[PDB]
Design an enzyme around this catalytic site. Structure first.
Site, mmCIF file in Angstrom:
data_model
loop_
_atom_site.group_PDB
_atom_site.id
_atom_site.type_symbol
_atom_site.label_atom_id
_atom_site.label_comp_id
_atom_site.label_asym_id
_atom_site.label_seq_id
_atom_site.Cartn_x
_atom_site.Cartn_y
_atom_site.Cartn_z
ATOM 1 N NE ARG A 1 -3.952 2.397 0.950
ATOM 2 C CZ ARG A 1 -4.176 3.527 0.257
ATOM 3 N NH1 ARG A 1 -3.530 3.812 -0.877
ATOM 4 N NH2 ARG A 1 -5.075 4.403 0.718
ATOM 5 N N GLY A 2 0.570 2.218 -0.807
ATOM 6 C CA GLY A 2 1.304 3.483 -0.824
ATOM 7 C C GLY A 2 0.475 4.605 -1.407
ATOM 8 C CB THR A 3 1.386 8.100 -2.434
ATOM 9 O OG1 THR A 3 2.618 7.817 -3.116
ATOM 10 C CG2 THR A 3 1.667 8.557 -1.008
ATOM 11 N N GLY B 1 -1.213 3.732 -4.585
ATOM 12 C CA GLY B 1 -2.445 2.995 -4.384
ATOM 13 C C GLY B 1 -2.154 1.689 -3.665
ATOM 14 C CG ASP C 1 12.048 8.129 -6.624
ATOM 15 O OD1 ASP C 1 12.963 8.638 -5.942
ATOM 16 O OD2 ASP C 1 11.050 7.580 -6.109
#
Ligand SMILES: Cc1ccc(-n2nc(C(C)(C)C)cc2NC(=O)NCCN2CCN(C(=O)Nc3cc(C(C)(C)C)nn3-c3ccc(C)cc3)CC2)cc1
Lengths: 330, 267
Positions: free
Chosen positions: A29-31, A33, A146
C-alpha cells in the site's frame, strides 16, 4: 448513448474480480495505491501477477501517464504492463503486471542484517541489467527520476529467474539525489539517473547507502554527507557549479577546507573495495559531481568491468538457491 | 526531446492502429445504410472542424488537437455514429488528449464552457440546441474511448517528420508554412489510419512543392521510400481539395446531421 452498444460491451467486458483471485493477497500500500499478488481464477495461466489499483478514481494525470507510457515500453529489464481494467461502477483503474518476488531494498537489507556481503558475480549482473533497462528508457527519452533500491525489482523462481525489472512508485531520503538537484537544478536529466545508479552500485558493493543521512530543493546535511564521501568539488571539477541557483548558499554554509582528507578512493578503501579495481573505476565515472562529466548508460555498459571475470549472467542468482524471503501478505 | 519519439516501428500506433482500408470500409457499411459515402465524408470533415475549434478555444497546441482528432477517428473506425453522440465524443477526445500530451486536466468549468461556446458561436448553423452534456457525461465517455482504443494513447503525427524533411532541403521558410497547413488538411480524411506519418509528410511536402513551383524531383528520387504509396496519398489530398470546393458545410450539415443514425434509449 446507444442501449444495444452499452449492454453488449457490458456483457463482454472482462472484470478484475471475475478473472483474478486477490482477496487478502495485498503485498503493498502506498500513495501509488494498492498492490496485490494475483493468480488467474480460470486456471489456464497458473502464474503470479502484480495487480495495482491506482490511487483515486477516473483517468487522473497519474493513471494516464502510467498507462500511456507502459503501453508502449517493451524491454526485458523494465516492468511490463500486461492488462488494464476500467471498473465502470466505481471508476477504479486496475493495472496487471509481472510479479517480481524480490527487490534490491530487501536483498541489500538481508545482507546488511547478516553480520555475508553481496556475491561479486551477482553485483555485476545487477548493475548490468539496471544499465541495460535505463539505456532503453533513455534512448526513448524516458527519464526515471527516482532510481533507488526499492525500484529495482528482481524476479523469483520461474522462466525469468533472477532478471531485473525496473519499476516506479511515482514519487517524482535524498540519498540517491544528484548534487545539482540539491543545489536547485530545475530539470531532470539522464545524468541524474546515472548518479542514482552509481549510488546503487556503491550500496551493492558495501551493503550501506553511500550518501546515508538522517531524514525547498536545498538540503544541507545531504550535501555535507556527499562532501564527507567525495570531497568538496574544485572549480575545475565542476565549472558550471557557479550557475546553480543555490551556489551562493553553498558558499555561505560550506568551506572547502572542511573536506581536505575526503575522497571516494578513501571511502571505498574503508569498505574493502580496491581503488585499483575495474569496479571502482566504473563507480567513479558514474559518481562524478559535474553532470556533464558523468558517463552515459551505454558507455557504462561498454566498460571493461563487464568483460572481466566473472561475466554478467541473465539470472542474477547464477542458478544458485535464492536465500531471500518471499513477500509477506498485509 | 519527447517520450517514445523514435519508436514508431515498435509502437502501438503502428502495430495496432494502422488499419486495412478494406476492413475500415467494411465496418463503415453499418452507417452507409443511413448516410451516403459523400455525406459520411462530409460529416468527418465537420467533426474535424469541431475538434479544431474546441482546441483553438482552449488554447491548445496543434499536436494536442491532432491527437484528439486521431482518437475520434479510431472510435468511429470501429463503431457506428449512433453508439455515442459525436457531439459528446469530440470534447471527450480533446479532454483525454490534453492529459496525454501533458497540458493538464482541463477543468470541469472550462471544458463544458468551451463546448457550449464553440457550438453556439461557430456552429449554430448545425446546432439549434445548446450543448446538453455535463462533466459526468464526459467522464463516462472517456472510459468507453480508452477501452476501444485498447489504452493506446501515444500518437505519432506528420509534423515532426515534415519539419525534418524541409530542414534537410534547406527550404524551411519557403515551404514549411504551406506543407504544415496541408498536413492539417489531411486530418479531414482517413489518411492517418492508413499510412505512417512520415509518408503523409512527404506527400504534403510534394504538393507544397508543386503549388509553389519548386523543383524537388532530385531530392524525392534520392529518398528510400515506396513512391507508389506516396502517390496514393497525394491523390487523396488532391481529391480533398475538389471536395472542399464542392461542399458548403454551412448549407448542408443540418440535414446531414439529421440523416445520421441516433442512439436507441433503454426499453
Ligand atoms: C504515475 C506513474 C507511476 C508509475 C509509472 N511507472 N514508470 C515506470 C518506469 C520504470 C517505466 C519509468 C514503471 C511504472 N510503474 C510501475 O512500475 N508499476 C508496477 C507496480 N508498482 C506497484 C507499487 N510498487 C511498490 O510497491 N514497490 C515497492 C517498494 C517496496 C518497499 C517496501 C521495499 C519500499 N515494496 N515494493 C513492492 C511491493 C510489492 C510488489 C509486488 C513489488 C514491489 C511500485 C511498482 C509511471 C507513472
Amino acid at each position: 448513448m446507444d442501449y444495444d452498444f452499452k449492454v453488449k460491451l457490458s456483457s463482454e467486458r472482462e472484470r478484475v474480480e471475475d478473472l483474478f483471485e486477490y482477496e487478502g493477497c495485498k503485498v503493498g500500500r502506498g500513495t501509488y495505491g494498492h498492490v496485490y499478488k494475483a493468480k488467474r481464477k480460470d486456471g489456464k495461466d497458473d502464474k503470479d501477477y502484480a495487480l495495482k489499483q491506482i490511487e483515486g478514481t477516473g483517468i487522473s494525470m497519474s493513471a494516464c501517464r502510467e498507462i500511456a507510457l507502459l503501453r508502449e515500453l517493451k524491454h526485458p529489464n523494465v516492468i511490463s504492463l500486461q492488462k488494464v481494467f476500467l471498473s465502470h461502477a466505481d471508476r477504479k483503474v486496475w493495472l496487471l503486471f509481472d510479479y517480481a518476488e524480490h527487490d534490491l531494498w530487501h536483498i541489500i537489507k538481508f545482507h546488511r542484517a547478516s553480520k555475508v556481503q553481496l556475491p561479486r558475480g551477482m553485483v555485476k549482473s545487477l548493475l548490468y541489467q539496471i544499465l541495460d533497462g535505463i539505456h532503453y528508457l533513455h534512448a526513448n527519452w524516458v527519464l526515471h527520476r527516482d532510481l533507488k533500491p526499492a525500484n529495482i525489482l528482481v524476479m523469483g523462481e520461474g522462466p525469468e529467474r533472477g532478471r531485473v525489472k525496473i519499476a516506479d512508485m511515482g514519487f517524482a531520503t535524498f540519498w540517491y539525489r544528484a548534487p545539482e538537484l540539491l543545489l536547485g537544478a530545475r530539470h531532470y536529466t539522464k545524468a541524474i539517473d546515472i548518479w542514482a545508479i552509481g549510488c546503487i552500485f556503491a550500496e551493492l558493493l558495501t551493503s550501506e547507502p553511500i550518501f546515508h543521512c538522517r531524514q525547498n530543493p536545498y538540503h544541507h546535511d545531504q550535501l555535507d554527507r556527499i562532501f564527507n564521501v567525495m570531497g568538496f568539488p574544485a572549480d575545475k571539477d565542476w565549472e558550471d557549479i557557479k550557475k546553480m541557483p543555490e551556489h551562493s548558499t553553498l558558499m555561505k554554509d560550506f568551506r572547502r577546507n572542511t573536506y581536505t582528507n575526503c575522497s571516494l578512493i578513501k571511502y571505498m578503501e574503508k569498505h574493502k573495495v580496491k581503488p585499483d579495481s575495474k569496479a571502482f573505476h566504473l563507480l567513479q565515472k558514474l559518481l562524478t559531481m559535474d553532470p556533464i562529466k558523468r558517463i552515459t548508460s551505454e558507455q557504462a555498459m561498454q566498460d571493461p568491468y563487464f568483460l572481466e571475470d566473472p561475466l554478467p549472467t541473465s539470472d542474477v542468482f547464477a542458478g544458485c538457491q535464492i536465500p531471500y524471503p518471499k513477500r509477506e501478505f498485509l | 526531446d519527447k517520450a517514445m519519439a523514435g519508436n514508431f516501428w515498435q509502437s502501438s500506433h503502428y502495430l495496432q492502429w494502422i488499419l486495412d482500408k478494406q476492413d475500415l470500409l467494411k465496418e463503415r457499411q453499418k452507417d452507409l445504410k443511413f448516410l451516403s459515402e459523400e455525406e459520411y465524408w462530409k460529416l468527418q470533415i465537420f467533426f474535424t472542424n469541431v475538434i479544431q475549434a474546441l482546441g483553438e478555444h482552449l488554447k491548445l497546441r496543434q499536436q494536442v488537437i491532432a491527437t484528439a482528432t486521431v482518437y475520434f477517428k479510431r472510435f468511429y473506425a470501429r463503431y457506428s455514429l449512433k453508439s455515442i453522440d459525436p457531439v459528446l465524443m469530440a470534447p471527450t477526445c480533446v479532454f483525454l488528449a490534453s492529459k496525454v500530451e501533458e497540458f493538464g486536466v482541463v477543468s470541469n468549468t472550462r471544458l463544458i464552457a468551451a463546448a457550449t461556446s464553440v457550438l453556439k458561436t461557430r456552429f449554430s448553423y448545425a446546432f439549434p440546441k445548446e450543448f446538453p452534456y455535463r462533466m459526468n457525461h464526459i467522464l463516462e465517455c472517456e472510459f468507453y474511448l480508452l477501452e476501444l482504443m485498447d489504452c493506446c494513447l501515444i500518437v505519432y503525427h506528420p509534423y515532426r517528420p515534415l519539419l525534418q524533411y524541409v530542414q534537410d532541403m534547406g527550404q524551411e521558410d519557403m515551404l514549411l508554412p504551406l506543407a504544415w497547413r496541408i498536413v492539417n488538411d489531411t486530418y479531414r480524411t482517413d489518411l492517418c489510419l492508413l499510412y505512417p506519418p512520415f509518408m503523409i509528410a512527404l506527400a504534403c511536402l510534394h504538393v507544397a512543392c508543386v503549388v509553389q513551383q519548386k523543383d524537388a524531383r532530385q531530392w524525392f528520387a534520392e529518398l528510400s521510400v515506396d513512391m507508389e504509396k506516396i502517390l496514393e496519398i497525394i491523390r487523396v489530398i488532391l481529391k480533398l481539395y475538389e471536395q472542399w470546393k464542392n461542399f458548403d458545410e454551412r448549407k448542408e450539415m443540418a440535414t446531414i446531421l439529421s440523416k445520421m443514425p441516433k442512439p436507441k434509449p433503454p426499453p
